[PDB]
Design a protein around this nucleic acid. Structure first.
Ligand SMILES: [Mg+2]
Ligand SMILES: [Mg+2]
Ligand SMILES: [Mg+2]
Ligand SMILES: [Mg+2]
Ligand SMILES: [Mg+2]
Ligand SMILES: [Mg+2]
Ligand SMILES: [Mg+2]
Ligand SMILES: [Mg+2]
Ligand SMILES: [Mg+2]
Ligand SMILES: [Mg+2]
Ligand SMILES: [Mg+2]
Ligand SMILES: [Mg+2]
Ligand SMILES: [Mg+2]
Ligand SMILES: [Mg+2]
Ligand SMILES: [Mg+2]
Ligand SMILES: [Mg+2]
Ligand SMILES: [Mg+2]
Ligand SMILES: [Mg+2]
Ligand SMILES: [Mg+2]
Ligand SMILES: [Mg+2]
Ligand SMILES: [Mg+2]
Ligand SMILES: [Mg+2]
Ligand SMILES: [Mg+2]
Ligand SMILES: [Mg+2]
Ligand SMILES: [Mg+2]
Ligand SMILES: [Mg+2]
Ligand SMILES: [Mg+2]
Ligand SMILES: [Mg+2]
Ligand SMILES: [Mg+2]
Ligand SMILES: [Zn+2]
Lengths: 66, 177, 136, 116, 52, 80
RNA sequence: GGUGAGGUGUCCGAGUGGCUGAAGGAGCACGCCUGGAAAGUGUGUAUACGGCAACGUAUCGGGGGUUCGUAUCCCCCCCUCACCGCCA
RNA sequence: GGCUCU
RNA sequence: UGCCUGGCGGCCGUAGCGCGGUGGUCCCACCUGACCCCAUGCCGAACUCAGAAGUGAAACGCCGUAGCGCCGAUGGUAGUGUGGGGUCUCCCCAUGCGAGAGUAGGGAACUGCCAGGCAU
RNA sequence: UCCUCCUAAAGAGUAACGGAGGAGCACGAAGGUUGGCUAAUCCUGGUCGGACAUCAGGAGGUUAGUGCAAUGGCAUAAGCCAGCUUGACUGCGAGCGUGACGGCGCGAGCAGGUGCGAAAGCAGGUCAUAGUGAUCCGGUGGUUCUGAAUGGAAGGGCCAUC
RNA sequence: CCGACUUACCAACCCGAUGCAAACUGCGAAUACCGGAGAAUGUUAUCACGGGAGACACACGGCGGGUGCUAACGUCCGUC
């Protein structure tokens, strides 16, 4: 790489709401506090729940009884 | 080089097993990652181009190569030689470290992330995806914005087929679907 | 009337018409009308003989036309002196050597092809003959 | 690919020396070894040759593909050329950069007595 | 024929000059070249002057 | 009376070609071929001019020959 | 018959390559005044095809082409204007 | 100041 | 002397593609790393340097294979120089030259110098 | 008037109010050198982004490119990038080509001095072929060559140039 | 919105077969031309320099062609 032209690329620490700690090299400089990581993202359970089609007959039978 | 070490220890053993390769060199490997921002609106002013290179330089710690028009087309009002985009090639450790920050931080920072496509592997293992918005990277400060951009990522690997790249990224727990 | 759609050039030299032909054998169909004489045909003569055999077969069978008029022929107007440029393109011809198969035909009997090619040959300036598909 | 582009990169000066009638020193460079040979102006036969694949040269060395090996080779080929009476040649880089092991070889041959 | 003609006067004190052309619209800046002066038998900077 | 034209022009013949053929003894500097391109190519003791003119650098006989992988035509002066 | 010039949305009209799929105005559609009309006045103001309406393609007489790019450049066909279409 | 028709 | 490999040529497709197989002692290749020599209109990708853990996957080389490519007769045909002739826009005769295309067929190159390795 | 192709009959040349097209410039880099590179088009995938911008791979293998017309060339690239630069040098020039002539052209090599390159070497404008105008007269700079009694000068000559 | 399907209304590319070209060529003659060697022949027939010219309105016929109507005792070229 060239010497001066590229920005500073320094290892910092990024902690998250799930308590993950990951040291990465970045151009931020300061330490980083995250919101979601790949550990705590609801991609493997929540997005599965998040389809939620629901039944029309079941709503019908739910609303009363004959 | 955390993911490069994870490649070298567990992905190679996995793929040699699940493909019955004769040699370990027969295994796929990632080669480069290309980060393009096609900026067609910089014909109004260079500073829009000049700011897109500054933003993408924060993402990947490289000064981007400002690309120009290969030829001239009149539908877009460009002549051969106009600076029309910016790219960054990432290889080596800086490639791996960006790929770590990507699949660990930025993909979760996508609004309404629900997976990727496994139908973006260009027939020959090389995967290409495109992000709508640069704020998913935490390098970018949200107030310090100028314009909501978008870029595209192109992971070039040594996989001959399409599935060998699909298995490689799945070995890196790449969020297909 | 057959005519090239585009041409690289608008006019052509008069040339000559010596030599033997190449489209000699009946390639595609079963029966053929072969030129014996020498000369130049036109798109009108071609289209008239096509009409005479299409009507003679009552659109039964299939007719190939092996030739195509690609040579432009210029003429000067009346009361114009011999100078002052080459004349204007008036019509299109095909140079015909002896042996050239002009037409082919199948799906019909031999005698019907004889009477059709005879009705066509009555519109053509050159002397023709009837041929069949030879094995080898 | 890389072999072919090196040849394309070399075949201009080779044809130029071919028409110059120049007795020509040919360098060939590998990651492990480096080769040298002095070729007659017909291009079909050699006069002297040296390498790091030879035992008499390689056994005095640490690694065959460094600059110190390349200088020992250019020295040996110069001492063989002057033994055979060949003094003025022209250096063919064979599509490499005049740099590093190639430059150290030619500088060694110049220092030992060859003239180019 | 917008490309007018000029002369490149020797800066060696001699009145020697080369003559040449230029586009003064696209090259407003003066031409300075180092050319041979056969009187002094040296390479001397010549400068653009008017053809007069 | 009437007419005109637009096709009256042509240029002068440049007298190209091969001035000295094979087996033909020449002096140094003698023009062998005048040509536009390198329809021929310069071999031994033969130079190529500014306009791809082939001239002899030495004295001797002309040798036409086809060499190279592209089967290009080379002209050489044999020694004599 | 030859030469030269030309052919613009409903109309007139400017319009010599890149903000001319169009100035501007008139006309037309819509509104307001008016008992109702006009004339004052104010507002809009291409055609088709295509998508889904993001918005895109075509057309400067028509048709073919140079060019990244043509309403503007070049050719062809027509149409028109002007001049010549003579001496015997 | 002038400002048609029904 | 045999085999293999590398370099430089000769020749320029009977020498090239394709398909299948095969090679790692050496060589070669990929390959490891890069603070340095040097380099990237970004990037050790390339170039370069320091090396030698791994693999022959790719590349390369070798072997095989007629799907092609290529080469290619013999005879004839076309043309044509000279002379002569006719029904003279075109042909014929004597004589000399003699194609192209196509057919049979060939055909998966040959060879030189140096160097190295393993065998002998 | 000049250039390119055909006519033009396999050396050159070759006419017509014969068939088709162009030129009357441009460039201080679009020249030189060293080093490096290799297209068109299409296919797939991909944020805005669309037939067509940019990006990644593959087919292809020059169907592209050449400052401009056409033809011939061009991969060792003559095509495309960057560095350094002014050989877009001065005096000459063996020897040839082409013209009735005037004239036009190619040119190795020599002397001087220079640029690039480690070096061999290359460079006396551009891939080539169009981009032009005789003489006279007159103008400008330089040069004692001449200078109508002598010394100068005017004027003339020579070199460069308009 | 996605489409549904079935026509014969066509059709790109590619492949196979078939033709044409003055301004097409992955082929390619005969002749002609340039150069060299060698006899025989020919009143040097060759070249250079010098003195004197004339001529520069051509015709037809054969072959190869442009143009014209493969019209002209037509016209314009090459060659005899
Ligand atoms: Mg427009
Ligand atoms: Mg009268
Ligand atoms: Mg009233
Ligand atoms: Mg009234
Ligand atoms: Mg294989
Ligand atoms: Mg490497
Ligand atoms: Mg292999
Ligand atoms: Mg034969
Ligand atoms: Mg044959
Ligand atoms: Mg083969
Ligand atoms: Mg093989
Ligand atoms: Mg000729
Ligand atoms: Mg001839
Ligand atoms: Mg150039
Ligand atoms: Mg070079
Ligand atoms: Mg695309
Ligand atoms: Mg040029
Ligand atoms: Mg006068
Ligand atoms: Mg005096
Ligand atoms: Mg005096
Ligand atoms: Mg021909
Ligand atoms: Mg006269
Ligand atoms: Mg005369
Ligand atoms: Mg005559
Ligand atoms: Mg006459
Ligand atoms: Mg005749
Ligand atoms: Mg005639
Ligand atoms: Mg006649
Ligand atoms: Mg005659
Ligand atoms: Zn988290």
């Amino acid at each position: 790489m060239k010497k001066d032209i590229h920005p500073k690329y320094e290892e910092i620490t990024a902690s998250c709401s799930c308590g993950n700690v990951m040291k990465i090299r970045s151009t931020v400089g300061h330490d980083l506090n995250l919101d979601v990581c790949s550990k705590c993202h609801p991609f493997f359970t929540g997005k599965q729940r998040d389809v939620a089609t629901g039944g029309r007959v079941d709503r019908f039978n739910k609303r009363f009884n004959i | 080089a955390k993911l490069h070490d994870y490649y070298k220890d567990e992905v190679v053993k996995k793929l040699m097993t699940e493909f019955n390769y004769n040699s370990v060199m027969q295994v796929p490997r990632v080669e480069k990652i290309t980060l393009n921002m096609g900026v067609g609106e910089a014909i109004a002013d260079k500073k829009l181009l000049d700011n897109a290179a500054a933003d993408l330089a924060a993402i990947s710690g490289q000064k981007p190569l400002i690309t120009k028009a290969r030829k001239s087309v009149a539908g877009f009002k460009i002549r051969q030689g106009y600076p029309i985009g910016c790219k960054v090639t990432l290889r080596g450790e800086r490639m791996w470290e960006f790929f770590e920050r990507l699949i660990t931080i930025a993909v979760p920072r996508i609004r309404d992330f629900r997976g990727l496509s496994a139908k973006s592997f260009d027939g020959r293992g090389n995967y290409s995806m495109g992000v709508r918005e640069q704020i998913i990277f935490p390098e970018i400060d949200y107030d310090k914005v100028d314009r909501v951009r978008g870029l595209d990522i192109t992971i070039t690997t040594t996989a001959k087929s399409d599935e060998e790249g699909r298995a490689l990224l799945a070995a890196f727990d790449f969020p297909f679907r | 009337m057959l005519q090239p759609k585009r041409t690289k050039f608008r006019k052509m030299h008069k040339g000559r018409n010596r030599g033997l032909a190449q489209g000699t054998d009946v390639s595609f169909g079963s029966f053929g009308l072969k030129a014996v004489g020498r000369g130049r045909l036109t798109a009108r003569q071609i289209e008239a003989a096509r009409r005479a055999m299409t009507r003679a077969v009552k659109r039964q069978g299939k007719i190939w036309i092996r030739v195509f008029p690609d040579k432009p022929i210029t003429e000067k107007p009346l009361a114009v002196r011999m100078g002052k440029g080459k004349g204007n393109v008036e019509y299109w011809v095909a140079l015909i050597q002896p042996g050239k198969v002009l037409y082919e035909m199948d799906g019909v009997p031999e005698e019907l092809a004889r009477e059709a090619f005879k009705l066509a040959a009555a519109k053509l300036p050159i002397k023709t003959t009837f041929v069949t598909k030879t094995v080898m | 690919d890389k072999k072919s582009a090196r040849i394309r990169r070399a075949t201009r000066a080779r044809r130029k020396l071919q028409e110059l009638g120049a007795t020509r020193l040919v360098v060939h460079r590998t990651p492990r070894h480096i080769y040298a040979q002095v070729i007659a102006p017909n291009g079909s036969e050699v006069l002297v040759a040296a390498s790091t694949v030879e035992k008499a040269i390689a056994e005095q060395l640490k690694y065959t593909g460094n600059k110190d090996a390349a200088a020992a080779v250019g020295k040996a080929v110069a001492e063989r050329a002057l033994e055979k009476g060949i003094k003025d040649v022209s250096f063919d880089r064979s599509g490499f950069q005049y740099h590093g092991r190639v430059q150290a070889l030619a500088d060694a041959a110049r220092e030992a007595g060859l003239q180019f | 024929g917008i490309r007018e003609k000029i002369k490149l006067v020797s800066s060696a004190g001699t009145g020697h000059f080369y003559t040449t052309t230029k586009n003064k619209r696209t090259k407003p800046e003066k031409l300075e070249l180092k050319k041979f002066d056969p009187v002094v038998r040296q390479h001397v900077i010549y400068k653009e002057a008017k053809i007069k | 009376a009437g007419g005109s034209t637009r096709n009256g022009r042509d240029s002068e013949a440049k007298r190209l070609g091969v001035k000295r053929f094979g087996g033909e003894s020449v002096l140094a500097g003698s023009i062998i071929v005048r040509q536009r391109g390198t329809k021929f190519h310069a071999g031994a003791n033969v130079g190529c001019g500014r306009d791809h003119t082939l001239f002899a650098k030495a004295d001797g006989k002309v040798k036409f020959e086809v060499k190279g992988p592209k089967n290009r035509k080379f002209i050489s002066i044999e020694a004599e």
